[PDB]
Amino acid sequence: PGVINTVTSGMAPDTKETIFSISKAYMQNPNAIILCIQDGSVDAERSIVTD
């Protein structure tokens, strides 16, 4: 599931927190290969995949 900087009133409050725990599938996996997908229109410094 994709990372979100702000939980919206349209999403339940824990959406970013649950995505971060799911994101550990690679953040804590030395055997994981990560395809980092920046949006081309938006600038490189705006994306959250960087962190």
């Binding site: 938006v42 600038d43 410094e45 705006r46």
Partner: protein, 51 residues
């Protein structure tokens, strides 16, 4: 008299008498106080956002 007309109402009270003078009030308070604690009673049209 010319200063009274130009720096006060030059046939333009709302638009000229206290719009440029508001900018002067902001410039002088920013010159005195580098911090914006005093500049809290003085509104601004603030544009913020991302990339």
């Amino acid at each position: 008299v010319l200063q009274k007309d130009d720096k006060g109402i030059h046939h333009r009270k709302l638009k000229k008498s206290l719009i440029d003078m508001y900018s002067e009030v902001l410039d002088v308070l920013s010159d005195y106080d580098a911090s914006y604690n005093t500049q809290d009673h003085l509104p601004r049209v603030v544009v913020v956002g991302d990339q």
